[PDB]
Design an enzyme around this catalytic site. Structure first.
Site, PDB file in Angstrom:
ATOM      1  N   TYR C  57       0.876  -1.168   0.000  1.00 34.11           N
ATOM      2  CA  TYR C  57       0.000   0.000   0.000  1.00 34.11           C
ATOM      3  C   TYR C  57       0.913   1.218   0.000  1.00 34.11           C
ATOM      4  O   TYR C  57       1.663   1.410   0.961  1.00 34.11           O
ATOM      5  CB  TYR C  57      -0.861  -0.054   1.250  1.00 34.11           C
ATOM      6  CG  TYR C  57      -1.901   1.036   1.465  1.00 34.11           C
ATOM      7  CD1 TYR C  57      -3.185   0.931   0.930  1.00 34.11           C
ATOM      8  CD2 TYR C  57      -1.624   2.117   2.279  1.00 34.11           C
ATOM      9  CE1 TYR C  57      -4.148   1.915   1.167  1.00 34.11           C
ATOM     10  CE2 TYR C  57      -2.586   3.107   2.531  1.00 34.11           C
ATOM     11  CZ  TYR C  57      -3.839   2.993   1.969  1.00 34.11           C
ATOM     12  OH  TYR C  57      -4.768   3.972   2.227  1.00 34.11           O
ATOM     13  N   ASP C 201     -26.164 -13.195  -2.660  1.00 30.21           N
ATOM     14  CA  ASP C 201     -27.370 -13.888  -2.178  1.00 30.21           C
ATOM     15  C   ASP C 201     -26.977 -14.553  -0.872  1.00 30.21           C
ATOM     16  O   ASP C 201     -25.789 -14.803  -0.633  1.00 30.21           O
ATOM     17  CB  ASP C 201     -27.812 -14.931  -3.200  1.00 30.21           C
ATOM     18  CG  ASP C 201     -29.228 -15.460  -2.958  1.00 30.21           C
ATOM     19  OD1 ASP C 201     -29.883 -15.100  -1.943  1.00 30.21           O
ATOM     20  OD2 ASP C 201     -29.755 -16.265  -3.769  1.00 30.21           O
ATOM     21  N   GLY C 275     -12.372   0.018  -4.104  1.00 30.56           N
ATOM     22  CA  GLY C 275     -11.884  -1.195  -3.484  1.00 30.56           C
ATOM     23  C   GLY C 275     -11.917  -2.371  -4.442  1.00 30.56           C
ATOM     24  O   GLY C 275     -12.473  -2.285  -5.548  1.00 30.56           O
ATOM     25  N   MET C 277     -12.049  -6.887  -4.603  1.00 24.29           N
ATOM     26  CA  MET C 277     -12.315  -8.183  -3.977  1.00 24.29           C
ATOM     27  C   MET C 277     -11.275  -9.172  -4.494  1.00 24.29           C
ATOM     28  O   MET C 277     -11.501  -9.866  -5.493  1.00 24.29           O
ATOM     29  CB  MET C 277     -13.743  -8.671  -4.283  1.00 24.29           C
ATOM     30  CG  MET C 277     -14.329  -9.636  -3.235  1.00 24.29           C
ATOM     31  SD  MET C 277     -16.101  -9.347  -2.816  1.00 24.29           S
ATOM     32  CE  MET C 277     -16.787 -11.049  -3.022  1.00 24.29           C
TER      33      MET C 277
END
Ligand code: NAP
Ligand code: NAP
Lengths: 193, 364, 364
Positions: C57, C201, C275, C277
């Protein structure tokens, strides 16, 4: 290591390097017909030909170091006819205790050397001027010229080729030379008679 | 009266399947005041034309029975060069012998002749007119026939979105051997922008690199080099030494190639996606958006110029001027002459099928 | 003197591997005129804090010997809530008892105390001050300790980039049950923006859906519905019937999900990626860029507010006001109180390990 590798002087240096068994690196400006030029210079005697972009490159430096290490030798001499960044790059490629000779300045840019080369690598930068060197050195002139003649007679040296313009009386002589000056970029110009 | 032929389709699909040639008649005697009849000099095959036929390009001509078919049909081709053969009584902007291009898309340029209005056309100078004006050069048929899409696209991508500082800033592009890429390299050279062209490797790489540098690419790299973590810092150095930044990427490939060129931008960079190779999305790592402030955007010349005649005219005049002044050369076309050896639609089908050989131009 | 504890690392790596606790002394009897000493009330574990320790980062504190280590070491954590305990002779901006957050990133908040300058800190109201000001609510510790990243992110993405017409326009987001997603739904309700949230879901889907609609989502759909060719036209109708347009998409997922939310924008839409995933690049079809004039960009709160005090201040004030007014709600953190009975770094290591349980707040 020399810059202005496509210069007439650069082309004689490459050949003389080959004749005396010196390894050399020629630095040249990138151009569209890069491959053809690199081939010509290697045939003349340059061991490696790099571009000025490669000369500038920190990333590429270690590759040059590999070449020199493999040879068992050292980069002891730099020939500079360009100045500016080019002069910086070829100086950095010398082993410690190196010498550079500046014999020309093909852009108006000054000879530019990082302070660290002088202090930490014991680099030395000097000049060369054949006219001054040979002024009171007629034996040295004669010996050098004789070697060039002999090499030409033996077929061991060839000329940096010229673009020839013949004077025949229809165009004023000064204009032939003016055209020659203006076409310098195309390559060495020879007015013939 | 004039017997013409048009390349048409009645259903969307692959050109090899759906294209046919239709013979139709144009009434050159029964001409309304504002009308103009033209003969085709040549028209190129562009990916957009093919996409239009395939049904995956959301801008197309209506299907009609105008060409003498029972089933409603659409003509093909969106750009091309025509010669004005006859004009109506109220037309002053054009006359017989004039060169023209369509003023709008969806005209149908894969055909021998057309009847339209005077405002369906834009005058380009023909070679006799350029010589009568003072110009050292006149436009070739290929130059005129391909002036309206590819040269405008390259020019507008390079000038309309981000300002590159002459003599220092950089753009990067993939599809470097494409016609648009060749125009972009030349325009970059003319405007004093530095550039990197990315191309696929090949046995004659040497030849292809030299050709692109001659056109104006500052550096040419392969897609292997584009993918290389090892090579990345070499590109960074090129940019740093120039004193400028890589501000603009032009993407017509997608996939890994698009990732590669995005990564070579300095922070705050803009990519323009103007094309894409067959089922292959623009893929960008999250890190470039978040940490490098990368922006990915689109370019469509049709849409940008639809309601902007001033931008079009101005861009067009520059390309014309550069051609006349001998400063721009055309992306070369493989020219196939419609001489009756083979029917019209098969010329275009062959053209579509031989697209990989390079840009294809049907001449007349 | 004050005996403090700080969580440090000398080398980048996984937090389970490289973190340790260092004891250090703060001289509270020798404050320079502008210096302030604070005691930590609470600091959270955010993905950015972990990424920072991992060395992946590109914003981090220097490694120094200032905590009394022989090896240069870095502190951890970028946000948190502190209480001022002492100030130097020239400090007017802060007073003992005031609540503060760091004015800048890389301060190090995973520790018991800090010595800084007054301008290293931004004052928030403590509950006593909010009440004294006639507000119905004082801030909780969690609300203060987590105010700097996630709420500001939601607010700025929604208001700083494209102007949504209240009562008409829409944003779409994925990660709809994320902290930022839940703030974004509330802020859309507060500002009268319509929104679609896309969520994964789950067995209690209809329940989650009702809970997000109460927060402020106009519609909630699954990732399967986002993927669905069949479902797409239903979404188009929602937006069409509203009178507005879907102008903004917020992406924290990448991959298929990012493609799906981008497809649901009207023409000329903007996506902000804030962001990712794990591993999944932002995947967008070429057609969206070219034919829909879609734009994909980034958002990073750390960079946006790095040198924009006025924007930070204004945004922070709005979030504070809404908390004081009971109009904004945080998700509950799992709070772990530092006792002295267990090394501080182990508390944060556990928190890193237990991340999926929920937001971890270490308290003091
Ligand atoms: O790069 C250019 C060429 O490589 C080179 C010029 O080549 P040339 O054949 O026309 O010139 P030469 O006659 O070989 O010599 C030119 C330079 O050497 C100096 N000199 C020669 C002999 C004796 C003396 C002396 N001191 O005894 C000196 C002479 O003054 C010249 O300086 O130049 C290259 N070039 C041109 N512009 C350049 C550049 N390199 C870098 N940057 C810039 N701007 P090409 O092949 O065209 O790409
Ligand atoms: O590489 C291939 C070629 O470089 C290229 C095709 O080149 P072309 O000359 O036939 O096509 P152009 O007319 O230059 O442009 C076509 C692309 O641009 C888009 N476009 C152009 C103008 C205006 C618009 C607009 N949006 O306003 C858009 C158009 O959609 C086209 O995409 O493609 C190369 N190629 C082919 N397959 C490839 C590939 N590169 C990488 N990977 C694959 N799969 P060569 O020389 O053969 O190696």
């Amino acid at each position: 290591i020399q810059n202005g590798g496509t210069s007439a002087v650069g082309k004689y240096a490459s050949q003389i390097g080959k004749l005396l068994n010196f390894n050399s690196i020629s630095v040249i400006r990138d151009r569209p017909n890069l491959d053809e030029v690199v081939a010509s210079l290697k045939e003349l005697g340059a061991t490696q030909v790099i571009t000025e972009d490669q000369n500038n490159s920190r990333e590429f430096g270690p590759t040059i170091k590999e070449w020199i290490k493999q040879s068992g030798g050292e980069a002891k001499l730099a020939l500079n006819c360009v100045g500016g960044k080019s002069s910086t790059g070829i100086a950095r490629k010398l082993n410690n205790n190196g010498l550079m000779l500046t014999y020309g300045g093909m852009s108006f840019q000054p000879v530019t050397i990082p302070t660290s080369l002088y202090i930490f690598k014991n680099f030395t930068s000097a000049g060369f001027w054949v006219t001054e060197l040979l002024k009171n050195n007629k034996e040295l002139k004669t010996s050098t010229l004789n070697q060039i003649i002999a090499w030409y007679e033996e077929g061991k040296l060839t000329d940096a080729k010229s673009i020839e313009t013949l004077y025949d009386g229809t165009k004023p002589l000064h204009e032939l030379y003016q055209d020659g000056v203006a076409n310098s970029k195309d390559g060495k110009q020879l007015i013939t008679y | 009266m004039i017997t013409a032929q048009a390349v048409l389709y009645t259903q969307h699909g692959e050109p090899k399947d759906v294209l046919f040639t239709q013979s139709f008649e144009i009434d050159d005697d029964n001409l309304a005041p504002n009308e103009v009849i033209v003969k085709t000099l040549g028209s190129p095959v562009n990916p957009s034309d093919i996409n239009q036929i395939q049904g995956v390009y959301p801008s197309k001509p209506a299907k009609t029975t105008g060409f003498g078919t029972t089933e409603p049909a659409a003509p093909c081709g969106n750009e091309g060069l025509f010669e004005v053969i006859k004009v109506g009584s109220n037309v002053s902007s054009l006359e017989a012998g004039d060169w023209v291009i369509p003023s709008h898309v969806n005209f149908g340029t894969w055909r021998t002749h057309a009847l339209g209005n005077d405002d369906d056309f834009i005058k380009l100078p023909n070679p006799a007119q350029s010589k009568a004006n003072g110009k050292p050069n006149g436009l070739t048929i290929n130059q005129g026939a391909t002036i309206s899409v590819n040269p405008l696209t390259a020019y507008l991508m390079l000038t309309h979105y981000v300002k590159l500082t002459p003599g220092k800033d950089w753009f990067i592009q993939n599809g470097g051997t494409s016609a648009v890429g060749k125009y972009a390299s030349q325009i970059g050279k003319l405007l004093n922008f530095n550039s990197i062209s990315v191309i696929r490797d090949r046995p004659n790489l040497d030849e292809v690199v030299a050709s692109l540098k001659e056109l104006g690419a500052t550096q040419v790299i392969t897609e292997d080099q584009n993918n290389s973590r090892e090579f990345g810092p070499t590109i960074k150095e090129w940019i740093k030494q120039s004193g400028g930044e890589a501000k603009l990427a032009l993407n017509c490939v997608g996939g890994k190639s698009s990732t590669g060129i995005a990564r070579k931008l300095n922070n705050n960079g803009l990519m323009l996606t103007y094309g894409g190779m067959s089922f292959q999305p623009v893929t960008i790592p999250t890190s470039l958006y978040i940490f490098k402030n990368f922006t990915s955007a689109g370019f469509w010349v049709t849409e940008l110029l639809k309601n902007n005649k001033e931008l079009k005219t101005s861009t067009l005049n520059q390309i014309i001027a550069w051609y006349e002044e001998g400063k721009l050369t055309d992306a070369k076309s493989i020219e196939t002459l419609y001489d009756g050896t083979k029917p019209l639609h098969e010329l275009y089908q062959d053209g579509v099928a031989n697209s990989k050989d390079g840009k294809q131009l049907i001449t007349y």
